């Protein structure tokens, strides 16, 4: 066969140990899922420094905690802007999931709270910037460097999916580079605990699986499709379904056609054809052997999964860091004052936050 006796025994034992790890991680998750934290700080506890990114419902700001001096990333959501029914449910999902998960490649939530106008989530500051801007600046990553980042996503999705969590917004914009060159996934705005199917039309156009676009009930395999899009974009410099307007992107996704740069290795193309698979009975991550079809693929043959988890693999690069609170690895955004109304807004919609 492909593996000799010793290699087959080592892999089987490794796979059993993953099961043991995930069972314990699920017990730890459920304790926190069933007893969330809330109201662990207030706005006046922080000095607001700079906007690190923006979104539909607000911004993420670098803040400095006044008493400790630690820097954090504070996501601010305008409660009124969170107007649509699925916008509201998704924000409750985001906070509840972030407070309960624990994994080396998931950002750590430290505080959450709300006031008359806004919702607030205070996370560890990840100073190396978004993968997005490093990728756009260099053009494309080499296959070994794309593989280093991809392996972290594979392990993170293995963890999340074991907890019945779907992520639903993988993209370089949501992947931050830490001081050791490893990934931190942020933005759980579309993450959801799902036991089987779910039906919300959400995500980012270029990363949507065909079954989302086609208004079908879908499952965690949408995240494996998205991994295919991400790996392709990291290695090519642009995503596989690329067009100026969303409707054109959607038509390309549904077609079942992908073309690859001539510099992609055959191993990479094979992996991508199996992730970017419109037929759910054939998509890697969705078959009998689960995540192992991905982890054991030839393109990952050089990947030491445990060493990646332990953060013992040399990273492709270490961001320059010039002291705490440095924002040099982030783009600039227009600054808008944080106004807190004298009247509580949407109090009933956000009772649980």
């Amino acid at each position: 066969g492909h593996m000799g006796n010793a290699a087959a025994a080592k892999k089987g034992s490794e796979q059993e140990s993953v099961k043991e790890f995930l069972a314990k991680a699920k017990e730890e998750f459920l304790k926190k899922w069933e007893s969330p934290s809330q109201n662990t700080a207030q706005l006046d506890h922080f000095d607001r420094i700079k906007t690190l990114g923006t979104g539909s419902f607000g911004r993420v700001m670098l803040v400095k905690h006044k008493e400790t001096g630690n820097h954090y990333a504070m996501k601010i959501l305008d409660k009124q802007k969170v107007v649509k029914l699925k916008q509201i449910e998704h924000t409750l999902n985001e906070k509840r999931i972030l407070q309960a998960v624990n994994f080396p490649f998931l950002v750590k939530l430290e505080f959450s709270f709300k006031d008359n106008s806004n919702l607030y989530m205070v996370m560890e500051y990840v100073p190396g910037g978004e993968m997005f801007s490093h990728l756009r600046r260099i053009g494309r990553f080499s296959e070994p460097h794309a593989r280093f980042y991809a392996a972290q996503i594979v392990l993170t999705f293995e963890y999340l999916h074991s907890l019945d969590l779907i992520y639903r917004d993988l993209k370089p914009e949501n992947l931050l580079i830490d001081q050791q060159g490893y990934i931190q996934v942020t933005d759980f705005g579309f993450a959801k605990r799902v036991k089987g199917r779910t039906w919300t039309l959400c995500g980012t156009p270029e990363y949507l699986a065909p079954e989302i676009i086609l208004s079908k009930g879908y499952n965690k395999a949408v995240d494996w499709w998205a991994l295919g899009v991400l790996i392709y974009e990291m290695a090519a410099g642009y995503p596989p379904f690329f067009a100026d307007q969303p409707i054109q992107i959607y038509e390309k996704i549904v077609s079942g056609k992908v073309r690859f740069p001539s510099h992609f290795s055959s191993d990479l193309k094979d992996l991508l054809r199996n992730l970017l698979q419109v037929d759910l009975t054939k998509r890697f991550g969705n078959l009998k052997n689960g995540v192992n079809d991905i982890k054991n693929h030839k393109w990952f043959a050089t990947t030491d999964w445990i060493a990646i988890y332990q953060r013992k693999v040399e990273a492709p690069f270490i961001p320059k860091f010039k002291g705490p609170g440095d924002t040099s690895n982030f783009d600039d955004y227009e600054e808008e004052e944080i106004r807190v109304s004298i009247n509580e807004k949407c109090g009933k919609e956000f009772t649980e936050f």
Binding site: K84, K86, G189, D244
Partner: peptide, 13 residues
């Protein structure tokens, strides 16, 4: 041709 800047998520459609 396609989108090179940061991409916003969609809540519908």
């Amino acid at each position: 041709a396609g989108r090179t800047g940061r991409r916003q998520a969609i809540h519908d459609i």
